[PDB]
Enzyme design. Sequence first.
Site, PDB file in Angstrom:
ATOM      1  N   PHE A  39      -0.096   7.427   1.510  1.00 30.34           N
ATOM      2  CA  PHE A  39      -1.211   7.261   2.459  1.00 30.34           C
ATOM      3  C   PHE A  39      -1.554   5.781   2.568  1.00 30.34           C
ATOM      4  O   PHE A  39      -1.462   5.063   1.555  1.00 30.34           O
ATOM      5  CB  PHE A  39      -2.414   8.112   2.050  1.00 30.34           C
ATOM      6  CG  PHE A  39      -2.025   9.556   1.889  1.00 30.34           C
ATOM      7  CD1 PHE A  39      -1.670  10.316   2.990  1.00 30.34           C
ATOM      8  CD2 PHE A  39      -1.930  10.123   0.630  1.00 30.34           C
ATOM      9  CE1 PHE A  39      -1.242  11.626   2.846  1.00 30.34           C
ATOM     10  CE2 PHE A  39      -1.518  11.438   0.488  1.00 30.34           C
ATOM     11  CZ  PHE A  39      -1.160  12.180   1.581  1.00 30.34           C
ATOM     12  N   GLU A  80       3.110 -11.963  -6.785  1.00 25.78           N
ATOM     13  CA  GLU A  80       4.518 -12.357  -6.495  1.00 25.78           C
ATOM     14  C   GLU A  80       4.546 -13.695  -5.742  1.00 25.78           C
ATOM     15  O   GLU A  80       5.470 -14.515  -5.969  1.00 25.78           O
ATOM     16  CB  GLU A  80       5.221 -11.248  -5.709  1.00 25.78           C
ATOM     17  CG  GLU A  80       6.664 -11.599  -5.364  1.00 25.78           C
ATOM     18  CD  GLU A  80       6.909 -12.124  -3.946  1.00 25.78           C
ATOM     19  OE1 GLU A  80       5.966 -12.106  -3.160  1.00 25.78           O
ATOM     20  OE2 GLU A  80       8.050 -12.580  -3.626  1.00 25.78           O
ATOM     21  N   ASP A 102       0.866  -1.212   0.000  1.00 25.96           N
ATOM     22  CA  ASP A 102       0.000   0.000   0.000  1.00 25.96           C
ATOM     23  C   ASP A 102       0.896   1.254   0.000  1.00 25.96           C
ATOM     24  O   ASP A 102       0.474   2.328  -0.573  1.00 25.96           O
ATOM     25  CB  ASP A 102      -0.971  -0.021   1.180  1.00 25.96           C
ATOM     26  CG  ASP A 102      -2.120   0.990   1.063  1.00 25.96           C
ATOM     27  OD1 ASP A 102      -1.874   2.169   0.944  1.00 25.96           O
ATOM     28  OD2 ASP A 102      -3.253   0.573   1.207  1.00 25.96           O
ATOM     29  N   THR A 105       0.789   5.532  -3.574  1.00 25.95           N
ATOM     30  CA  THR A 105       0.440   6.648  -2.666  1.00 25.95           C
ATOM     31  C   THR A 105       1.034   6.369  -1.276  1.00 25.95           C
ATOM     32  O   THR A 105       0.958   5.230  -0.776  1.00 25.95           O
ATOM     33  CB  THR A 105      -1.066   6.937  -2.578  1.00 25.95           C
ATOM     34  OG1 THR A 105      -1.650   5.861  -1.873  1.00 25.95           O
ATOM     35  CG2 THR A 105      -1.737   7.120  -3.915  1.00 25.95           C
ATOM     36  N   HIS A 135      11.101  -9.866   5.485  1.00 30.11           N
ATOM     37  CA  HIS A 135      11.808 -10.956   4.738  1.00 30.11           C
ATOM     38  C   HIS A 135      12.287 -12.029   5.721  1.00 30.11           C
ATOM     39  O   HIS A 135      12.433 -13.223   5.341  1.00 30.11           O
ATOM     40  CB  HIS A 135      12.962 -10.377   3.928  1.00 30.11           C
ATOM     41  CG  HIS A 135      12.446  -9.542   2.813  1.00 30.11           C
ATOM     42  ND1 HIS A 135      13.266  -8.733   2.061  1.00 30.11           N
ATOM     43  CD2 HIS A 135      11.172  -9.314   2.379  1.00 30.11           C
ATOM     44  CE1 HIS A 135      12.544  -8.101   1.174  1.00 30.11           C
ATOM     45  NE2 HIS A 135      11.257  -8.395   1.372  1.00 30.11           N
TER      46      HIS A 135
END
Length: 595
Positions: A186, A258, A110, A184, A351
């Site tokens: 945000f 992914e 995000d 973005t 990770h």
Amino acid sequence: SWEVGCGAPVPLVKCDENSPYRTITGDCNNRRSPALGAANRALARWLPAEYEDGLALPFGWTQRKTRNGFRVPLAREVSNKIVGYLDEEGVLDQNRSLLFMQWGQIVDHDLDFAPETELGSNEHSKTQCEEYCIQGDNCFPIMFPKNDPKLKTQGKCMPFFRAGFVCPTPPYQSLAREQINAVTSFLDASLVYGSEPSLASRLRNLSSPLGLMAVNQEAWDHGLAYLPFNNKKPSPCEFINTTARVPCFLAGDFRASEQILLATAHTLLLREHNRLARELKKLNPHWNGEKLYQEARKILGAFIQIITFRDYLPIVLGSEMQKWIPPYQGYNNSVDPRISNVFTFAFRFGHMEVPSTVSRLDENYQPWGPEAELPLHTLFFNTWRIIKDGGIDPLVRGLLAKKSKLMNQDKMVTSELRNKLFQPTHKIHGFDLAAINLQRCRDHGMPGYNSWRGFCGLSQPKTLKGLQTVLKNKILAKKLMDLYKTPDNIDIWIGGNAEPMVERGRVGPLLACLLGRQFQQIRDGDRFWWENPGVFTEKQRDSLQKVSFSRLICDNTHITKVPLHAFQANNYPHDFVDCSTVDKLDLSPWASREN
Ligand SMILES: *[C@@H]1O[C@H](CO)[C@@H](O[C@@H]2O[C@H](CO)[C@@H](O[C@@H]3O[C@H](CO[C@H]4O[C@H](CO)[C@@H](O)[C@H](O[C@H]5O[C@H](CO)[C@@H](O)[C@H](O)[C@@H]5O)[C@@H]4O)[C@@H](O)[C@H](O[C@H]4O[C@H](CO)[C@@H](O)[C@H](O)[C@@H]4O)[C@@H]3O)[C@H](O)[C@H]2NC(C)=O)[C@H](O)[C@H]1NC(C)=O
Ligand code: HEM
Ligand SMILES: *[C@@H]1O[C@H](CO)[C@@H](O[C@@H]2O[C@H](CO)[C@@H](O)[C@H](O)[C@H]2NC(C)=O)[C@H](O)[C@H]1NC(C)=O
Ligand SMILES: *[C@@H]1O[C@H](CO)[C@@H](O)[C@H](O)[C@H]1NC(C)=O
Ligand SMILES: *[C@@H]1O[C@H](CO)[C@@H](O)[C@H](O)[C@H]1NC(C)=O
Ligand SMILES: [Ca+2]
């Protein structure tokens, strides 16, 4: 007095006073500085970039150019000597479900994406880099050390292409090289809706004024939607199984396929948008398609914000939560909401939480079929295992009932990511995410470990003994000194992740500080933060308080039993309750209005 102008790609949009919803690009959020936190602009610099030539060349570019009088070690040699381990026994987090890892990757998507330079098209640059391992302009190959097994089986390097940078992308300029954030800043469900007007429109169902997102027209999951396919060629999801020929999904974020559990989480979020749009249409029959889309988008953004700040960050930051992210006091238009360049490395702590296997579980939380458990590396860009092997419910059951990997100073990154990563266009399951993270730290001009310790008001160890004390680990400190020679040269990703975790948290103090500062900024600097007065009503905020990941699952799968606290380790059947006992989101306060 400054060069503030430079935004040459310039997705420039004028801002409308009293506009009721977020833009897709994130423009107009801050009234005084309307590009702040908008997509396709420079990542913020909390500290000045550190390049070998002061402007654009990474440390390690020129063999004879030292950092502080010492050569920087090969990223792959650090990976091999420090990051790697053989034995997965005992590595799991006894108090974090696999959803803990997966929510982190979702939030990360995000907030930030610094993609590789485009550098034109239909040329011999990418092939050249992959074939002859020759460093040049955007080719910054990860060279294998002499004793690397991959030197014996995989040639002289892993191809690596430098990240895109803002004003011109092919040529350079007079200031330091500034990498792009393509999404973005945000926390706004941009990974569902897109950060660009074109993708945002492509993802919508504009055939009906119902405010729906587009869904897959080729396959359904027991009556529930899949994301549309991306029919762009070539497809990495087709590449990894040319018999099945199942394309990648199209989502708000480029990276949605992914790995199979990221595609799973994306599917839940898409379903939740369409469920909200249907429910708002029944409540408010005169609302048009644009209004339904925007109101469902606003609720889904609030869901993501609340899960993140109420449920996720407290169990990442533990004791440091109240230090860096105090209780919300309101929108502050003086806060910089832009994601920093360093944050994009700090958040890669995830990770070290990725375990070696993914399980599918049946309606009794028992193994799904004869290969219920699969190696993670077989699930990179794998969408056929969803469509053709049970849909998302068995994967969501595994997300609840299986555990995250626990960060371990002796077992940092699983070989599924460290030796078997698949990258699109590169054909092999042979890449190293740890080496890539270290090479990317240098590509982005990152200041070293002690610069960030100072930034965070922490001690800057200068000696082996000083580093042993900070890391609480003699052998780890010794291995880092043998490779880096001074703690000033340790790459921020490995230095931050080497620190012991704070109490009740899953990162050490340096990362708690960097992460906590960023999350405080994206909350306080967001005019559309869910708790900001006037974004929602009092009664809407009271309804939103009851959101949970468990209800998301109950509402958008055929799973009938879920845990109440989905981020902790839960065992079936003891910790699992009936969906009917889980709080619901009451949409009655979204009534257009009543009296
Ligand atoms: C965007 O949003 C729109 C809806 O607003 C989506 O459109 C609809 O898609 C679904 C498929 O995803 C279509 O459903 C099919 O429906 C038929 C049954 O048809 C009857 O009922 C339909 C629903 O009310 C209705 O639309 C039909 O009317 C149309 O067709 C007749 C001719 O049959 C025509 O006379 C009318 O004028 C209309 O043109 C009709 O009354 C059902 O048979 C289908 O199933 C078969 O196919 C699937 C696989 O495709 C298979 O699983 C089944 O076993 C079986 O083989 C299927 O369910 C629906 O018709 C579409 N609605 C409209 C208005 O076109 C659209 O898909 C969304 N797009 C995206 C990209 O998300
Ligand atoms: C495959 C990959 C994952 C899981 C199997 C995975 C997981 C995570 C988690 C859990 C994260 C945070 C909690 C997280 C953050 C970020 N990632 Fe990582 N990730 C996988 C694969 C990749 C690859 C490949 C990259 C690109 C590496 C490069 O530098 O080219 C990657 C990046 C990041 C990232 C940076 C995003 C950006 O700003 O560009 C995170 C913040 N991940 N992942
Ligand atoms: C590619 O996908 C196909 C499914 O489309 C996989 O094949 C199934 O695998 C086993 C046999 O080994 C059986 O369940 C089915 O008979 C197979 N189906 C088909 C069409 O062959 C296949 O294993 C996948 N291969 C890889 C490399 O992932
Ligand atoms: C597990 O973690 C949660 C917070 O994430 C905490 O409330 C709970 O006590 C922890 N359980 C154990 C057994 O430590
Ligand atoms: C608003 O932000 C600025 C910059 O961080 C800060 O100095 C100021 O104290 C903040 N105002 C508050 C917390 O009310
Ligand atoms: Ca965003």
